[PDB]
Amino acid sequence: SGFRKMAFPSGKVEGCMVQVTCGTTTLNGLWLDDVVYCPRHVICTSEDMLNPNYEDLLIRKSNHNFLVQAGNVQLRVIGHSMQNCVLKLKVDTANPKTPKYKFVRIQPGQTFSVLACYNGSPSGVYQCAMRPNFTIKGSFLNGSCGSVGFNIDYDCVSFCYMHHMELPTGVHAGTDLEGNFYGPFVDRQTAQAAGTDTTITVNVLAWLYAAVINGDRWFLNRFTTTLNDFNLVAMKYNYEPLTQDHVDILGPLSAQTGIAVLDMCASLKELLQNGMNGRTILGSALLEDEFTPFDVVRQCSGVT
Amino acid sequence: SGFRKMAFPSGKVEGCMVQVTCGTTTLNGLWLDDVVYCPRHVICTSEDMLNPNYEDLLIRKSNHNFLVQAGNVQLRVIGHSMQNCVLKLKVDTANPKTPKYKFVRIQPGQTFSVLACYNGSPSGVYQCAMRPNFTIKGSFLNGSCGSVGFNIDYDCVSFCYMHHMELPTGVHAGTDLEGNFYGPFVDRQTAQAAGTDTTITVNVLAWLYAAVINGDRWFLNRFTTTLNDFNLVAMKYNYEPLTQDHVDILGPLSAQTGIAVLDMCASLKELLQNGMNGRTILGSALLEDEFTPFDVVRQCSGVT
Numbered sequence: 001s002g003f004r005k006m007a008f009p010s011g012k013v014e015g016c017m018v019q020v021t022c023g024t025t026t027l028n029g030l031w032l033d034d035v036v037y038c039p040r041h042v043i044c045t046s047e048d049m050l051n052p053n054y055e056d057l058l059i060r061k062s063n064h065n066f067l068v069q070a071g072n073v074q075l076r077v078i079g080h081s082m083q084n085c086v087l088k089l090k091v092d093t094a095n096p097k098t099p100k101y102k103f104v105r106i107q108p109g110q111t112f113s114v115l116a117c118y119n120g121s122p123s124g125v126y127q128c129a130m131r132p133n134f135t136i137k138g139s140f141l142n143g144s145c146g147s148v149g150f151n152i153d154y155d156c157v158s159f160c161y162m163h164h165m166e167l168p169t170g171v172h173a174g175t176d177l178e179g180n181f182y183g184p185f186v187d188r189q190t191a192q193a194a195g196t197d198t199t200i201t202v203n204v205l206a207w208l209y210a211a212v213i214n215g216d217r218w219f220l221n222r223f224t225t226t227l228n229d230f231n232l233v234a235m236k237y238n239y240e241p242l243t244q245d246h247v248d249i250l251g252p253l254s255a256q257t258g259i260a261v262l263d264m265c266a267s268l269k270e271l272l273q274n275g276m277n278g279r280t281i282l283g284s285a286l287l288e289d290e291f292t293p294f295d296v297v298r299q300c301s302g303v304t
Numbered sequence: 305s306g307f308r309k310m311a312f313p314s315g316k317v318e319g320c321m322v323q324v325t326c327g328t329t330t331l332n333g334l335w336l337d338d339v340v341y342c343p344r345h346v347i348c349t350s351e352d353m354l355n356p357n358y359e360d361l362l363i364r365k366s367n368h369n370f371l372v373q374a375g376n377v378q379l380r381v382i383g384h385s386m387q388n389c390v391l392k393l394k395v396d397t398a399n400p401k402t403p404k405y406k407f408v409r410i411q412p413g414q415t416f417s418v419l420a421c422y423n424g425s426p427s428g429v430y431q432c433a434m435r436p437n438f439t440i441k442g443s444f445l446n447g448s449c450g451s452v453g454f455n456i457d458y459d460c461v462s463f464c465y466m467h468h469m470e471l472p473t474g475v476h477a478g479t480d481l482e483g484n485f486y487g488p489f490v491d492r493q494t495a496q497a498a499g500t501d502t503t504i505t506v507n508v509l510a511w512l513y514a515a516v517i518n519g520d521r522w523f524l525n526r527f528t529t530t531l532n533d534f535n536l537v538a539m540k541y542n543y544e545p546l547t548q549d550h551v552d553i554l555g556p557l558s559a560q561t562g563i564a565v566l567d568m569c570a571s572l573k574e575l576l577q578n579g580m581n582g583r584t585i586l587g588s589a590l591l592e593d594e595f596t597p598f599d600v601v602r603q604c605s606g607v608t
């Protein structure tokens with residue numbers, strides 16, 4: 001029993017982290033097979049960042065201007081290309097620790113672990129969600145760029161995120177491992193205002209299930225609701241609309257607990273309208289939205 | 305910027321996790337050098353657990369009754385002893401992945417990462433504190449016993465916890481790696497009521513510092529207080545007494561932010577007396593007490 005914000009074990013990703021230096025910029029790269037992936041803004045000064053022309057900056061760089069260090073051993077760069085907002089550095093050595101891996105582009109509301117790194121050295125791991133405005137609320141200092149977000153399915157690491165930017169509001173923007181930004185963000189130091197940070201309704205319901213399963217039941221009420229009725233209250237509270245797909249996804253938690261999804265919706269409706277009245281749910285004073293239904297089932301069943 | 309509940313990278317501990325089976329009980333062991341550490345209740349049936357005589361149960365066991373599996377390779381057990389509440393199984397092979405390590409007994413209020421495991425396979429990592437009543441609020445299902453808590457200093461893993469028990473109230477009890485329980489708890493399935501779960505005041509102040517450093521400043525007030533005055537309010541709110549040692553420990557955060565410790569105490573005093581009024585601090589609706597001053601300095605400076 002007990003329910004924790006749990007990251008995936010980080011070991012398989014720790015074995016992929018390298019330091020990339022281009023002139024006076026150092027940040028992190030991901031070494032998979034004989035390729036190192038890193039933010040293309042490694043080639044930028046902080047002055048470059050105000051209005052970089054990446055293609056033009058890049059022409060001045062040779063393979064030997066990219067210094068790749070894995071632990072305290074330098075890798076030899078034998079090729080470099082730009083793919084969208086990532087650089088791919090071909091090195092002469094396949095990472096001996098390459099795990100089985102996929103590159104996946106996640107949808108907003110999906111959760112992932114981040115291995116926060118500096119000079120290619122891991123400092124910590126934490127669990128995130130891709131917010132509905134395609135930001136993440138990370139912990140990222142200068143030198144953390146190239147830190148990656150991932151899920152693990154048994155032995156297969158699915159890489160979903162690479163850290164590129166802190167927006168002036170202190171939230172985080174980044175790309176998939178094809179170098180495409182999540183949302184409308186760009187690797188330029190300019191005004192970039194995120195949209196509404198809505199609450200991931202389906203994740204909140206999952207976490208209310210997780211709570212019931214762990215003995216926190218005070219918020220269970222006598223009411224039900226309908227998707228359309230619930231969704232009027234969701235709109236009012238900057239909660240994502242709930243779809244029949246979300247209902248279906250919560251089906252197994254519904255089954256395990258014997259609480260119909262729409263009953264738990266009515267419970268959430270009362271929490272939104274009445275607040276917590278100084279009470280907590282799984283040790284939180286607010287409604288947690290960074291557990292997916294899959295996360296709740298994994299953690300509550302004990303998947304390794 | 306941003307501030308996250310961050311675990312240590314788990315890789316060095318993942319390389320130490322094995323499965324220990326004694327008859328029909330399977331749980332996790334820690335393989336360091338040629339020794340595997342595990343809860344001594346591996347030798348118990350769930351019936352044994354109601355009133356186990358460990359010495360008497362243990363006499364019936366031979367080296368070959370202990371099945372140690374590292375990945376899908378069996379280790380050969382050449383010795384077993386009981387030390388307090390842990391079994392030490394001598395195996396004929398030194399773990400090739402043994403990191404530099406220490407066994408340390410932490411004090412209440414100190415934080416650590418847990419690698420939650422099942423059948424010797426890691427499922428996740430999360431950050432904890434030893435509560436002032438010597439419990440932890442973990443996430444631990446059946447088969448999770450032998451899962452360990454640790455800090456890392458650069459390359460040296462300090463092991464501080466091994467998971468033994470879920471108390472009837474759903475909180476967690478365990479030992480150091482010498483097999484001594486934190487607090488008054490015992491490896492027996494019986495009424496064991498934890499004391500008052502007080503809030504780790506020094507950790508809350510550290511986290512208010514972390515917040516100020518990350519731009520959450522709304523709770524900064526015009527008041528100061530004294531240790532004795534603050535401590536009257538702490539008592540009332542089941543907060544640990546603040547000592548001059550805690551003040552000293554917060555000194556560097558004080559220096560970095562230019563907010564005297566007693567001013568931040570007066571800020572906390574107002575939060576305790578007035579509550580949050582529906583506001584948040586680093587995305588929490590309650591005062592977080594599972595960051596140490598060391599944790600705040602590490603995460604805010606970027607230590608790897």
Ligand SMILES: CC(=O)Nc1ccc(Oc2ncccn2)cc1
Pocket residue numbers: 054055056058059079080081082
């Ligand atoms: C686009 C730019 O500004 N400079 C650049 C041009 C061609 C390049 O050649 C290349 N090499 C290996 C694989 C793929 N591509 C690399 C970098």
Ligand SMILES: CC(=O)Nc1ccc(Oc2ncccn2)cc1
Pocket residue numbers: 358359360362363383384385386
């Ligand atoms: C205490 C008990 O009930 N049974 C037991 C007795 C002596 C033991 O010998 C031993 N062997 C190696 C190192 C240290 N000790 C082991 C287990």
